Structure formats: C-alpha cells, structure tokens
Amino acid sequence: VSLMEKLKWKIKCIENKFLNYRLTTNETVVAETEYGKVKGVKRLTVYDDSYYSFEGIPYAQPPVGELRFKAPQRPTPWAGVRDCCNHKDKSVQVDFITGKVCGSEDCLYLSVYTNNLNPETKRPVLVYIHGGGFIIGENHRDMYGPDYFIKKDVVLINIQYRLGALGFLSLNSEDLNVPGNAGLKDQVMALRWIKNNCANFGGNPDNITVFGESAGAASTHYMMLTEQTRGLFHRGILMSGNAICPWANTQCQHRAFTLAKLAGYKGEDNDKDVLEFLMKAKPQDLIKLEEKVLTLEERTNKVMFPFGPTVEPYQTADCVLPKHPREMVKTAWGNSIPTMMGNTSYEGLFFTSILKQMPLLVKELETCVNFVPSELADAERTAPETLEMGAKIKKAHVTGETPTADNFMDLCSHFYFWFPMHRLLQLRFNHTSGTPVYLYRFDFDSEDLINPYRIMRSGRGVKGVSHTDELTYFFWNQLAKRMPKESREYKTIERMTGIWTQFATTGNPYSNEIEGMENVSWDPIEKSDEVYKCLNISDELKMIDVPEMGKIKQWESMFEKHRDLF
Ligand SMILES: *[B]([O])([O])C1=[C][C]=C2[C]=[C][C]=[C]C2=[C]1
C-alpha cells in the first residue's frame, strides 16, 4: 500500500462521486416487492446507454446486536415506499487500498438493474456474487457497475453478504446457534428473495443464472451444492473458483477463541464466554485483528484465511454445509443444471505483490512439500511420501535448476484453481443427470482498460492474464474509461457480456451472432474425455485443448496410492 496509490484512489473516489451524480437522471420509478414498494432511478453510462437502478434493497434483517454471527432473518415489511436510489454500505472489511477498516454491520442488501422495467418478454436474470476471499468486496457500482451488461436485455442483480469473522464465525456448542456460514446463509436468503421478486422488475423467475468470480465462484458452487437452494435457479457459472479449492473452506471452530484473545478476552476457552465477548466487541476491532489469527503453522500449510465457509458442526434449520463439499457433490441438485466453468491463462500472476513482500516463499519450490494437498501431507511435511509427492509438483512447475518467481506463480495457478477444477469435474461426472458443463479459458491481455485488483496485485507493467483480469470486461469500475467502438477492449466486453448472456438465456454459451465465434464449435466436457477442450478467449476466439492439462494430470498422480481421496 503506497500513498500515491491512496491519493490517486482518493481522487478517483472523488471523481466517482461527481461522475455518479452527473450520470444520475431525474427519472425516478417505483416497483413492487413482497416486502413493499421500492423507488429506483435511471442512470447513464459512458457509452450513452441507460438503465433503471435499485440499490439498498434489504433481503434480510440487519444482523446487528443479538443477530451478529447468526443466520439472517427475513426483513420487516414497510408501508409506503423504501428509498432505493442510493447504495448501502459494504460489509465490514479492511479496505485493501487505504488499509483501514471500512463498511458496516448493516450490509445485507442487493441491487437490481435493467435497461427496461417493462419488457415485452420475461427476461433472463443474472445474479452476481462478488469474490474477495470471503473477507473483502461490495456490490457498489464503483467496483461492479452494470453498465456493460445492461446493453443486453437481461436483469442483473448484485448481492452483498457478511464477510470475515462476522460472516463465518463457527462454534461447536449447539446451545449458541453459531454453527457457521452465516455469510453463505445470507446468500441463500438473497437468492430466495430474487426467486420471489425478479418478476417485479421484468425478470423470468424460471430462468435465473447465478455467477461469481473467486470466492464468488466458490459461493456460486455452494449455492449449487446445498439442498437449501434446490431449484432456485437454472444455470451456474464458476469463474476462477469452486467449493473444493483449498482456500474455499476451513475448519475454523478453534479460531474464535484466538480472535477473542487477540481482542483482549480474559477467561478460559469455552464457546459461550468467547461468544459473549465477541458479541460486544466493536466490529472494526475484530476485522482489523482478523489478520493475526492464523498461526505460523497454518500459514505454512497454506491456510489462506482464518474464517471462511466451514463444515457446520451440527444441523440447524438454515444449515448450508452439513458435510465436506466433496461429499456434498455426491447428492447435489446443482450437478444437473447447465454449468460453465473457466480460469484465466495465468491465474497465479495475482500473487506478485505477496511474493514481493515474501521472497523466501519461492524457496518452497525446492521440494514443494508445502503445496502437496493437505489431506495427503503429514503435519511436519517431512515424511518420505510427502517429499515424493512434492517432487511430482516440482517436476510439473520448476523449469530450471533453481526455482524462480514465475515457477511459483504458475504452480499457484494449479494449486488454487486448475487442479481443484479438475477434481470437481471428475467427481461431478460420477453424480450427474448428464447436463452439460462448458469450459472457457480467459486469455485476453490489455493494460488500456483495468480494474482496481491490478493495483492490489501490483500488476502494472506486468504481462499475462491474472486472476480477476476478466472482471474488467464484465463490470464497470471507477478506473474504467469509454473505449473506442472498434478497440480490442470494447470488442471483448461485447463478447464476454454476450457469451454470458447467451448461456444465461439458453444454457448453451454458443451464438454465431457473437463476433469471432464464426468457426467455433463449443462442446461441453464428457466423462470419457481424457483431454479437456475449452473456448480460449483472446483477440481470437478459438476452441483448443486445455494447455494446463499436462500439469493437471501430474497433480492428479500424487493421488496414485490414495485414489479414494481424489
Ligand atoms: B478471490 O478474489 O476470492 C481470491 C482472493 C484471494 C486468494 C488468495 C489465495 C488463493 C486464492 C485467492 C482467491
């Protein structure tokens, strides 16, 4: 975090405020909801388009006081008209630029957008779930502006949900009603709201697509796995993530005590007293301290976050994750809806800024033992089996006699994204009606149009297509500009919003009306396939064999003598 990047962020925040006002119109409107009337307004885009905007729609009771760490409750209906011409605050979190805690405990809202409140036909409804490691993110239009998607005749909905310890505290004690996954339960309630109210905004409740990137993709997957959401939607898109990625879940039940102690709790480790203390702490204190919870051992074993989605220790009415996601894949209703998955062509490039602050990490590639899947590794990672397995990973990613930064980031692409995708695909194939899954590979590189995550990963001057690089061609953000109609950036926006809208509509991502798809034949993956095929999205759109396949198989070989765990 550099203060050049902070003042420039501050000014760009000042520019966004002014530009947001300028793009507002006097055309206010009112829609019905099952909780009562809401007022939206129409807004403009830098491409001189327009959309109706409804923000700050509550799908839940504000989870403050006694509701903190609890499952969300249905909100209270109102007489009259709720104001929805302004956004609400984001979930309490550390601002990844300024480094200070921001946002609010009062954050359970969604936003609805559409270019036409009164469409002649019922429209496809796309529900976006933002990523951010389940610890940062927002549905604010400064990061996720609908300006591109509203060029299309869809209804787009952006949700928030509780982040970090406030979203994912978990306690073993059944008396306390904090089993965990509050934030995922937030997601479930927002979906239930969407199913029952999208018609009011011109949306077809029988054609809803959920999609998300990173932790949003893992989230989308959880919404496809849990029985809580059965039938609530009809297509799913997992962008650079799913629920069996190693970062997408953790058993965090022991960590609440550690948080409390970091916050000055005095007493013993029992769930009741830990909870009573955590209930009274300022929310900003728990979030700022969240960074210190993980032990050095956990960090070494690649646990990324102290609080996240978890296997709930006991069952409740609102339980989302009754067992490990791999098990949930066995019985998952979501296995039988049209699915599209994909990754970018150099995911691990995202880890530059972290590698820069911790150069020693590259030495981990000398044996690679710390990247062996945890379920296979011994605790000390000194077992000869673990050294053998680490050697397989090393052979896959270390190019010379000494490991480099790029070898590290390439390995990261597979550890965090490609290999879990592979495991999910093969697992899913053993438990599905036969509905298609399509693979894309996002391979479009540009520095002419960016999003704020590039400022976070310090990918300025850096070639390749990182984790989150594709967000730029889906959503408006306050660093974006109006691009020339014939620019490669503008055309990629059209293709990406076009493919996504196409799949949402029909469950098949192909359309010959999308420019560049003239010679594309986009077939979904079959159980019998030994080599994955994917739509490689670059300046050219091209069906190719997944380049990463060789390394994927090499990761898979670690499981040769433990096939039951694959
Ligand atoms: B994604 O933005 O939810 C995401 C954030 C941070 C990560 C750290 C380590 C591995 C994977 C990540 C994904």
Coordinates of C-alpha atoms and ligand atoms in Angstrom, one line a residue:
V1 CA 0.0 0.0 0.0
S2 CA 1.6 3.2 -1.3
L3 CA 0.1 6.7 -0.7
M4 CA 0.5 7.6 -4.3
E5 CA -1.9 4.8 -4.9
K6 CA -4.0 6.2 -2.0
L7 CA -4.3 9.8 -3.1
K8 CA -4.9 8.6 -6.6
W9 CA -7.5 6.3 -5.2
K10 CA -8.9 9.2 -3.1
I11 CA -9.2 11.4 -6.1
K12 CA -10.6 8.7 -8.3
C13 CA -13.1 8.2 -5.4
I14 CA -13.8 11.9 -5.6
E15 CA -14.2 11.6 -9.4
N16 CA -16.6 8.7 -9.0
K17 CA -18.8 10.7 -6.6
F18 CA -19.0 13.6 -9.1
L19 CA -19.4 11.3 -12.2
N20 CA -22.1 9.2 -10.4
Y21 CA -24.1 12.4 -9.7
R22 CA -23.6 13.5 -13.4
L23 CA -24.9 10.2 -14.7
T24 CA -27.9 10.3 -12.4
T25 CA -31.3 11.3 -14.0
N26 CA -34.5 12.8 -12.6
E27 CA -36.4 9.8 -13.9
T28 CA -37.3 8.0 -10.6
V29 CA -39.6 4.9 -10.6
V30 CA -41.3 2.6 -8.2
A31 CA -41.5 -1.2 -8.2
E32 CA -43.4 -3.7 -6.1
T33 CA -41.7 -6.2 -3.8
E34 CA -43.1 -8.8 -1.5
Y35 CA -41.9 -6.6 1.4
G36 CA -43.4 -3.4 -0.1
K37 CA -42.7 -0.7 -2.6
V38 CA -39.2 0.4 -3.6
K39 CA -38.1 3.5 -5.5
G40 CA -35.3 3.3 -8.1
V41 CA -33.9 5.8 -10.6
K42 CA -32.5 5.6 -14.2
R43 CA -28.8 6.2 -14.7
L44 CA -26.5 6.8 -17.7
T45 CA -23.3 5.0 -18.8
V46 CA -20.2 6.5 -20.5
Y47 CA -21.4 4.7 -23.7
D48 CA -24.6 6.8 -23.5
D49 CA -26.8 3.8 -22.6
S50 CA -29.3 3.9 -19.7
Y51 CA -30.6 1.6 -17.0
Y52 CA -33.0 1.6 -14.1
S53 CA -31.1 1.3 -10.8
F54 CA -32.4 0.0 -7.5
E55 CA -29.9 -0.3 -4.7
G56 CA -30.2 -0.9 -0.9
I57 CA -32.9 -3.5 -1.2
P58 CA -32.8 -5.4 2.1
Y59 CA -33.2 -9.2 1.8
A60 CA -32.5 -9.7 5.5
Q61 CA -32.8 -8.1 8.9
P62 CA -29.7 -6.1 9.7
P63 CA -27.5 -8.6 11.6
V64 CA -26.6 -6.4 14.5
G65 CA -26.8 -6.9 18.3
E66 CA -28.1 -10.4 19.1
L67 CA -28.2 -11.3 15.4
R68 CA -24.4 -11.0 15.0
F69 CA -22.8 -14.3 13.9
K70 CA -26.4 -15.7 13.5
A71 CA -28.2 -16.9 10.3
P72 CA -30.1 -14.0 8.6
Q73 CA -33.7 -13.3 9.3
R74 CA -36.4 -12.2 6.9
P75 CA -36.6 -8.4 6.9
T76 CA -39.6 -6.4 8.2
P77 CA -42.2 -5.2 5.6
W78 CA -43.0 -1.5 5.4
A79 CA -45.9 0.6 4.4
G80 CA -45.1 3.3 1.8
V81 CA -42.0 3.4 -0.4
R82 CA -38.4 2.5 0.6
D83 CA -35.8 4.8 -0.9
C84 CA -33.5 2.8 -3.2
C85 CA -31.8 5.5 -5.2
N86 CA -28.6 5.1 -3.2
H87 CA -26.3 2.3 -2.3
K88 CA -25.9 1.0 1.3
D89 CA -22.6 0.3 2.9
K90 CA -20.3 -2.7 2.2
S91 CA -19.7 -5.5 4.8
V92 CA -17.1 -4.6 7.5
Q93 CA -13.7 -5.2 6.0
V94 CA -10.2 -3.9 5.6
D95 CA -10.0 -1.5 2.7
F96 CA -7.4 -3.2 0.6
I97 CA -6.0 0.2 -0.5
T98 CA -6.2 2.5 2.5
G99 CA -5.6 -0.3 4.9
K100 CA -8.2 1.0 7.4
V101 CA -11.4 -0.8 8.4
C102 CA -14.4 0.4 6.5
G103 CA -18.0 -0.6 5.9
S104 CA -20.9 -1.5 8.2
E105 CA -22.6 -4.4 10.0
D106 CA -25.7 -3.2 8.3
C107 CA -24.9 -4.6 4.9
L108 CA -27.3 -7.2 3.8
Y109 CA -28.6 -5.6 0.6
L110 CA -28.9 -6.4 -3.1
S111 CA -29.1 -4.1 -6.2
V112 CA -31.3 -4.6 -9.2
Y113 CA -30.6 -3.2 -12.7
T114 CA -32.3 -3.4 -16.1
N115 CA -32.5 -1.2 -19.3
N116 CA -36.3 -1.7 -19.3
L117 CA -38.6 -2.0 -16.3
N118 CA -41.4 -3.1 -18.7
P119 CA -40.0 -5.7 -21.1
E120 CA -42.4 -7.2 -23.6
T121 CA -41.0 -10.7 -22.7
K122 CA -39.9 -12.1 -19.3
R123 CA -36.1 -11.7 -19.2
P124 CA -33.2 -13.9 -18.1
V125 CA -32.0 -13.0 -14.5
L126 CA -28.3 -13.0 -13.8
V127 CA -27.2 -12.9 -10.1
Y128 CA -23.6 -11.9 -9.4
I129 CA -21.8 -12.9 -6.3
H130 CA -18.5 -10.9 -5.8
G131 CA -15.2 -12.5 -4.8
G132 CA -12.7 -11.2 -2.3
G133 CA -11.6 -14.3 -0.3
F134 CA -14.8 -14.0 1.8
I135 CA -13.1 -11.1 3.5
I136 CA -13.5 -8.2 1.1
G137 CA -15.9 -7.0 -1.5
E138 CA -19.0 -5.0 -2.3
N139 CA -21.9 -4.5 -4.7
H140 CA -21.0 -0.9 -5.2
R141 CA -21.0 0.3 -8.8
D142 CA -17.5 1.7 -8.3
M143 CA -16.3 -1.9 -8.5
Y144 CA -19.2 -3.8 -10.0
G145 CA -21.1 -1.4 -12.3
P146 CA -23.8 -3.0 -14.5
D147 CA -23.1 -0.5 -17.4
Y148 CA -21.9 -3.2 -19.8
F149 CA -24.5 -5.9 -19.0
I150 CA -27.4 -3.5 -19.4
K151 CA -26.5 -3.2 -23.1
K152 CA -28.2 -6.6 -23.1
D153 CA -31.8 -7.4 -22.4
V154 CA -31.3 -9.0 -19.0
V155 CA -32.0 -8.3 -15.4
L156 CA -28.7 -8.1 -13.4
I157 CA -28.6 -8.4 -9.6
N158 CA -25.6 -7.8 -7.4
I159 CA -25.7 -9.1 -3.8
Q160 CA -23.7 -8.4 -0.6
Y161 CA -23.2 -10.9 2.2
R162 CA -21.3 -10.9 5.5
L163 CA -17.5 -11.1 5.3
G164 CA -14.7 -12.4 7.6
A165 CA -15.3 -13.3 11.2
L166 CA -18.8 -11.6 11.1
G167 CA -19.8 -13.8 8.3
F168 CA -18.0 -17.1 9.1
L169 CA -17.5 -17.4 12.9
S170 CA -18.2 -21.0 13.9
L171 CA -18.6 -22.6 17.3
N172 CA -19.0 -26.3 18.3
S173 CA -21.5 -25.6 21.1
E174 CA -25.0 -26.4 19.8
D175 CA -26.6 -24.2 22.5
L176 CA -25.1 -21.0 21.0
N177 CA -26.6 -21.2 17.5
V178 CA -23.4 -20.2 15.7
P179 CA -22.7 -23.2 13.6
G180 CA -21.0 -21.1 10.9
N181 CA -21.5 -20.0 7.3
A182 CA -23.7 -17.0 8.2
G183 CA -22.5 -15.3 5.0
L184 CA -23.5 -18.2 2.8
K185 CA -26.8 -18.2 4.5
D186 CA -27.0 -14.5 3.6
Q187 CA -26.5 -15.6 0.0
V188 CA -29.3 -18.2 0.3
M189 CA -31.8 -15.7 1.6
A190 CA -30.9 -13.2 -1.2
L191 CA -31.5 -15.9 -3.8
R192 CA -34.9 -16.7 -2.2
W193 CA -35.7 -13.0 -2.4
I194 CA -34.6 -13.0 -6.1
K195 CA -36.8 -16.0 -7.0
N196 CA -39.8 -14.3 -5.4
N197 CA -39.3 -10.7 -6.7
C198 CA -37.4 -10.7 -10.0
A199 CA -40.7 -10.8 -11.9
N200 CA -41.4 -7.4 -10.5
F201 CA -38.5 -6.0 -12.4
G202 CA -39.4 -7.9 -15.6
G203 CA -37.4 -11.0 -14.9
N204 CA -38.3 -14.6 -15.6
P205 CA -38.1 -16.5 -12.3
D206 CA -37.9 -19.7 -14.3
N207 CA -34.6 -18.6 -15.9
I208 CA -32.1 -17.4 -13.3
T209 CA -28.4 -17.7 -13.7
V210 CA -26.0 -17.4 -10.7
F211 CA -22.4 -16.5 -11.4
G212 CA -19.3 -15.2 -9.4
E213 CA -15.5 -14.9 -9.6
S214 CA -13.1 -16.2 -6.9
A215 CA -14.8 -16.6 -3.6
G216 CA -17.9 -15.6 -5.6
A217 CA -17.3 -18.7 -7.8
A218 CA -16.9 -20.9 -4.7
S219 CA -20.0 -19.2 -3.4
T220 CA -22.0 -19.9 -6.6
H221 CA -20.8 -23.5 -6.3
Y222 CA -22.0 -23.7 -2.6
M223 CA -25.4 -22.4 -3.8
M224 CA -25.4 -25.3 -6.3
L225 CA -24.4 -27.8 -3.7
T226 CA -26.7 -27.1 -0.7
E227 CA -30.2 -28.5 -0.5
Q228 CA -31.4 -25.2 0.8
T229 CA -31.5 -23.7 -2.7
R230 CA -32.9 -26.6 -4.7
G231 CA -34.4 -25.4 -8.0
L232 CA -34.0 -21.7 -7.1
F233 CA -32.0 -21.2 -10.3
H234 CA -31.2 -22.8 -13.6
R235 CA -27.6 -22.1 -14.8
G236 CA -24.3 -21.7 -13.0
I237 CA -21.0 -20.0 -13.9
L238 CA -17.9 -20.7 -11.9
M239 CA -15.3 -18.1 -12.7
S240 CA -11.8 -19.0 -11.4
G241 CA -13.1 -20.9 -8.4
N242 CA -15.3 -23.6 -6.8
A243 CA -16.1 -25.1 -3.4
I244 CA -13.3 -27.7 -3.3
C245 CA -10.5 -25.2 -3.9
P246 CA -8.3 -25.5 -0.8
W247 CA -8.8 -21.7 0.1
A248 CA -12.7 -22.0 -0.2
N249 CA -13.2 -23.8 3.1
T250 CA -11.6 -24.2 6.5
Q251 CA -12.4 -25.9 9.9
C252 CA -12.2 -22.7 11.9
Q253 CA -14.0 -23.7 15.1
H254 CA -10.9 -23.4 17.3
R255 CA -10.1 -19.9 16.0
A256 CA -12.9 -17.9 17.7
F257 CA -11.0 -18.1 21.0
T258 CA -7.9 -16.9 19.3
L259 CA -9.7 -13.9 17.9
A260 CA -11.2 -13.1 21.3
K261 CA -7.8 -13.3 22.9
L262 CA -6.3 -11.0 20.3
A263 CA -9.1 -8.6 21.2
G264 CA -8.4 -8.8 25.0
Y265 CA -10.7 -11.6 26.2
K266 CA -9.9 -12.7 29.7
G267 CA -11.1 -16.1 30.8
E268 CA -10.9 -19.7 29.6
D269 CA -11.6 -21.3 26.2
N270 CA -15.3 -22.2 26.2
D271 CA -17.7 -21.3 23.4
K272 CA -20.2 -19.4 25.5
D273 CA -17.9 -16.9 27.1
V274 CA -15.9 -16.5 23.9
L275 CA -19.1 -15.7 22.1
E276 CA -20.4 -13.3 24.8
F277 CA -17.2 -11.3 24.5
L278 CA -17.2 -11.4 20.7
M279 CA -20.8 -10.1 20.7
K280 CA -19.8 -6.9 22.5
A281 CA -16.6 -6.1 20.6
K282 CA -16.6 -3.3 18.1
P283 CA -16.9 -4.8 14.7
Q284 CA -13.9 -2.8 13.4
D285 CA -11.7 -4.3 16.1
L286 CA -12.5 -8.0 15.2
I287 CA -11.9 -7.3 11.5
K288 CA -8.6 -5.4 11.9
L289 CA -7.4 -8.2 14.1
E290 CA -8.5 -10.9 11.8
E291 CA -5.1 -10.7 10.1
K292 CA -3.3 -12.1 13.1
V293 CA -5.5 -15.1 13.8
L294 CA -3.7 -17.8 11.7
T295 CA -0.7 -19.4 13.3
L296 CA 2.6 -19.7 11.5
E297 CA 1.9 -23.4 11.1
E298 CA -1.4 -22.8 9.4
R299 CA 0.2 -20.2 7.1
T300 CA 2.9 -22.7 6.2
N301 CA 0.3 -25.3 5.4
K302 CA -1.4 -22.8 3.0
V303 CA -4.4 -21.9 5.0
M304 CA -5.3 -18.5 3.5
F305 CA -8.0 -17.2 5.7
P306 CA -8.8 -17.8 9.4
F307 CA -12.6 -17.6 8.9
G308 CA -14.5 -18.9 5.9
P309 CA -17.0 -21.5 4.7
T310 CA -16.9 -24.5 7.0
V311 CA -18.4 -27.9 7.7
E312 CA -21.1 -27.0 10.2
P313 CA -20.5 -28.9 13.5
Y314 CA -24.3 -29.7 13.9
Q315 CA -27.5 -29.3 11.9
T316 CA -30.0 -26.4 12.2
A317 CA -32.9 -25.3 10.1
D318 CA -30.7 -23.0 8.0
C319 CA -27.6 -25.2 7.7
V320 CA -25.9 -24.9 4.3
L321 CA -22.9 -27.1 4.6
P322 CA -23.7 -30.3 6.5
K323 CA -20.5 -32.1 5.3
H324 CA -17.3 -31.6 3.3
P325 CA -18.1 -30.1 -0.2
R326 CA -16.6 -33.2 -1.9
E327 CA -19.3 -35.3 -0.1
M328 CA -22.0 -32.7 -1.0
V329 CA -21.0 -33.1 -4.7
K330 CA -22.4 -36.6 -4.4
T331 CA -26.0 -35.6 -3.8
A332 CA -26.0 -32.0 -5.3
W333 CA -29.1 -30.8 -7.2
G334 CA -26.8 -28.3 -8.9
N335 CA -25.0 -31.2 -10.7
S336 CA -28.0 -31.3 -13.0
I337 CA -28.2 -27.7 -14.3
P338 CA -26.2 -26.3 -17.2
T339 CA -22.8 -25.3 -15.9
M340 CA -19.9 -23.2 -17.3
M341 CA -16.5 -23.1 -15.7
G342 CA -13.3 -21.3 -16.5
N343 CA -10.0 -19.8 -15.5
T344 CA -7.6 -17.1 -16.8
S345 CA -4.5 -18.1 -18.7
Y346 CA -2.1 -17.0 -16.0
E347 CA -4.0 -17.1 -12.7
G348 CA -1.1 -17.2 -10.2
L349 CA 0.3 -13.9 -11.7
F350 CA -2.1 -12.5 -9.0
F351 CA 0.4 -13.4 -6.3
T352 CA 3.1 -11.0 -7.4
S353 CA 2.6 -8.4 -4.6
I354 CA 2.6 -11.1 -2.0
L355 CA 5.7 -12.8 -3.5
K356 CA 7.3 -9.3 -3.4
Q357 CA 6.8 -9.0 0.3
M358 CA 7.8 -12.6 1.0
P359 CA 10.6 -13.6 -1.4
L360 CA 11.5 -16.6 0.7
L361 CA 8.3 -18.2 -0.5
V362 CA 10.0 -19.1 -3.7
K363 CA 12.3 -21.5 -1.8
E364 CA 9.3 -23.6 -1.0
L365 CA 9.6 -24.9 -4.6
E366 CA 12.9 -26.5 -3.7
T367 CA 10.9 -29.6 -2.6
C368 CA 7.3 -28.2 -3.0
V369 CA 6.2 -30.2 0.1
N370 CA 4.1 -27.2 1.3
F371 CA 1.8 -27.4 -1.8
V372 CA 1.0 -31.1 -1.5
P373 CA -2.7 -31.2 -0.8
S374 CA -3.1 -31.1 3.0
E375 CA -5.2 -34.3 3.2
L376 CA -2.2 -36.2 1.7
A377 CA 0.6 -34.4 3.6
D378 CA 1.9 -35.3 7.0
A379 CA 1.9 -32.5 9.6
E380 CA 5.6 -31.7 9.5
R381 CA 5.7 -32.4 5.8
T382 CA 8.9 -34.4 6.3
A383 CA 7.6 -37.9 5.5
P384 CA 9.2 -39.5 2.5
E385 CA 5.8 -40.0 0.9
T386 CA 5.4 -36.2 1.2
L387 CA 8.8 -35.5 -0.3
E388 CA 7.9 -37.9 -3.2
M389 CA 4.6 -36.1 -3.9
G390 CA 6.2 -32.7 -3.7
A391 CA 8.7 -34.0 -6.3
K392 CA 5.8 -34.6 -8.7
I393 CA 4.7 -30.9 -8.3
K394 CA 8.3 -29.7 -8.7
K395 CA 8.6 -31.7 -11.9
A396 CA 5.5 -30.0 -13.2
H397 CA 6.4 -26.4 -12.5
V398 CA 10.2 -25.9 -11.8
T399 CA 11.8 -25.1 -15.2
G400 CA 15.5 -24.8 -14.3
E401 CA 18.0 -25.9 -11.6
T402 CA 16.7 -23.2 -9.2
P403 CA 13.0 -22.2 -8.8
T404 CA 12.0 -18.7 -9.9
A405 CA 9.2 -16.3 -9.2
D406 CA 7.4 -17.3 -12.3
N407 CA 7.6 -21.1 -11.5
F408 CA 6.0 -20.1 -8.2
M409 CA 3.1 -18.3 -9.8
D410 CA 2.5 -21.0 -12.4
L411 CA 2.3 -23.6 -9.6
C412 CA -0.1 -21.3 -7.8
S413 CA -2.4 -21.3 -10.9
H414 CA -2.8 -25.1 -10.4
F415 CA -2.8 -25.4 -6.6
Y416 CA -5.5 -22.8 -6.2
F417 CA -7.5 -23.1 -9.4
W418 CA -6.8 -25.6 -12.2
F419 CA -6.3 -28.7 -10.0
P420 CA -9.5 -28.2 -7.9
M421 CA -11.4 -27.6 -11.1
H422 CA -10.2 -31.0 -12.4
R423 CA -11.1 -32.8 -9.2
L424 CA -14.6 -31.2 -9.2
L425 CA -15.2 -32.2 -12.9
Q426 CA -14.2 -35.8 -12.4
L427 CA -16.1 -36.0 -9.1
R428 CA -19.2 -34.4 -10.6
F429 CA -19.1 -36.8 -13.6
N430 CA -19.8 -39.6 -11.2
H431 CA -23.0 -38.0 -9.9
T432 CA -24.9 -36.2 -12.7
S433 CA -28.0 -36.5 -14.9
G434 CA -25.9 -35.6 -17.9
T435 CA -26.5 -31.8 -18.1
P436 CA -23.5 -30.2 -20.0
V437 CA -20.5 -28.4 -18.5
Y438 CA -18.6 -26.0 -20.7
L439 CA -15.0 -24.8 -20.1
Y440 CA -13.6 -21.3 -21.1
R441 CA -10.1 -20.1 -20.8
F442 CA -9.7 -16.3 -20.5
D443 CA -6.6 -15.2 -22.4
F444 CA -7.2 -11.6 -23.3
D445 CA -4.4 -9.2 -22.1
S446 CA -4.6 -5.4 -22.0
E447 CA -3.3 -2.5 -19.9
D448 CA -5.5 0.0 -21.7
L449 CA -8.5 -0.9 -19.5
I450 CA -8.1 -2.2 -16.0
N451 CA -9.8 -2.7 -12.6
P452 CA -8.6 -1.9 -9.0
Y453 CA -7.4 -5.5 -8.3
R454 CA -4.4 -4.8 -10.6
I455 CA -3.5 -2.0 -8.2
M456 CA -3.7 -4.5 -5.4
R457 CA -1.6 -7.2 -7.0
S458 CA 0.8 -4.6 -8.4
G459 CA 0.3 -5.9 -12.0
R460 CA 1.2 -2.5 -13.6
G461 CA 3.7 -3.2 -16.3
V462 CA 3.2 -6.9 -15.9
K463 CA 2.4 -9.1 -18.9
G464 CA 0.0 -12.1 -18.7
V465 CA -3.7 -12.6 -17.7
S466 CA -4.0 -12.7 -13.9
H467 CA -6.8 -13.8 -11.5
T468 CA -9.5 -11.1 -11.7
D469 CA -8.2 -9.6 -15.0
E470 CA -11.5 -10.7 -16.7
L471 CA -13.7 -8.6 -14.3
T472 CA -12.8 -5.5 -16.4
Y473 CA -14.7 -6.8 -19.4
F474 CA -17.8 -7.6 -17.4
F475 CA -18.4 -4.7 -15.0
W476 CA -17.8 -1.0 -14.9
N477 CA -15.3 0.3 -12.3
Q478 CA -14.1 3.7 -11.3
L479 CA -10.8 3.3 -13.1
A480 CA -12.6 2.4 -16.4
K481 CA -13.0 4.7 -19.4
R482 CA -15.1 5.0 -22.5
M483 CA -13.3 2.9 -25.1
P484 CA -13.4 3.2 -29.0
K485 CA -16.1 1.1 -30.6
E486 CA -13.5 -0.8 -32.6
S487 CA -10.9 -1.3 -29.9
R488 CA -9.9 -4.9 -28.8
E489 CA -11.1 -3.9 -25.3
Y490 CA -14.5 -2.8 -26.4
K491 CA -15.0 -5.9 -28.5
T492 CA -14.0 -8.2 -25.6
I493 CA -16.7 -6.5 -23.5
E494 CA -19.3 -7.4 -26.2
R495 CA -18.1 -11.0 -26.5
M496 CA -18.0 -11.6 -22.7
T497 CA -21.3 -10.0 -21.8
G498 CA -22.6 -11.7 -25.0
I499 CA -21.5 -15.2 -24.2
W500 CA -22.6 -14.8 -20.6
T501 CA -26.0 -13.5 -21.6
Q502 CA -26.2 -16.3 -24.2
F503 CA -25.6 -19.1 -21.7
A504 CA -27.9 -17.4 -19.2
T505 CA -30.7 -17.5 -21.7
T506 CA -30.3 -20.9 -23.2
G507 CA -27.9 -22.9 -21.1
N508 CA -25.6 -23.1 -24.2
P509 CA -22.8 -20.5 -24.4
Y510 CA -22.6 -20.6 -28.2
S511 CA -24.0 -18.0 -30.5
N512 CA -23.0 -17.3 -34.1
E513 CA -24.2 -13.8 -33.6
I514 CA -21.2 -13.2 -31.3
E515 CA -18.3 -11.7 -33.3
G516 CA -15.3 -14.1 -33.6
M517 CA -17.4 -17.2 -32.9
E518 CA -17.8 -17.8 -36.7
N519 CA -15.7 -21.0 -36.7
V520 CA -16.3 -22.0 -33.1
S521 CA -17.8 -25.4 -32.2
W522 CA -18.1 -25.3 -28.4
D523 CA -18.8 -28.7 -27.0
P524 CA -19.2 -29.5 -23.3
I525 CA -16.9 -31.9 -21.5
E526 CA -17.7 -35.6 -21.4
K527 CA -16.8 -38.2 -18.7
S528 CA -14.9 -40.2 -21.4
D529 CA -12.7 -37.2 -22.3
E530 CA -9.1 -37.7 -21.5
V531 CA -8.2 -34.1 -22.6
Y532 CA -10.4 -31.1 -21.7
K533 CA -11.4 -28.8 -24.5
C534 CA -12.1 -25.1 -23.8
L535 CA -13.0 -21.9 -25.6
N536 CA -9.8 -19.9 -25.5
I537 CA -10.8 -16.2 -25.3
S538 CA -8.2 -13.9 -26.7
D539 CA -8.2 -11.4 -29.6
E540 CA -9.2 -14.6 -31.4
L541 CA -11.9 -16.9 -30.1
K542 CA -10.6 -20.5 -30.5
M543 CA -11.5 -24.0 -29.3
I544 CA -8.3 -25.6 -28.0
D545 CA -7.2 -28.4 -25.8
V546 CA -6.6 -27.0 -22.3
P547 CA -2.9 -26.2 -22.2
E548 CA -2.8 -26.8 -18.5
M549 CA -3.9 -30.4 -18.9
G550 CA -0.4 -32.0 -18.7
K551 CA 0.3 -30.4 -15.4
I552 CA -3.2 -31.2 -14.1
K553 CA -2.5 -34.9 -14.7
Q554 CA 0.8 -34.5 -12.9
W555 CA -1.0 -33.1 -9.9
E556 CA -3.5 -36.0 -10.1
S557 CA -0.7 -38.5 -10.0
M558 CA 0.0 -37.5 -6.4
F559 CA -3.2 -39.5 -5.6
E560 CA -2.0 -42.7 -7.3
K561 CA -1.8 -44.6 -4.0
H562 CA -4.7 -42.7 -2.4
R563 CA -7.4 -42.8 -5.1
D564 CA -10.2 -42.7 -2.6
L565 CA -9.2 -39.2 -1.6
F566 CA -9.0 -37.7 -5.1
Ligands
LIG1 B1 -10.6 -14.4 -4.9 O1 -10.6 -12.7 -5.1 O2 -11.9 -14.6 -3.9 C1 -9.2 -14.9 -4.1 C2 -8.7 -14.0 -3.2 C3 -7.5 -14.3 -2.5 C4 -6.9 -15.6 -2.7 C5 -5.7 -15.9 -2.0 C6 -5.1 -17.1 -2.2 C7 -5.7 -18.0 -3.1 C8 -6.8 -17.7 -3.8 C9 -7.5 -16.5 -3.6 C10 -8.6 -16.1 -4.4

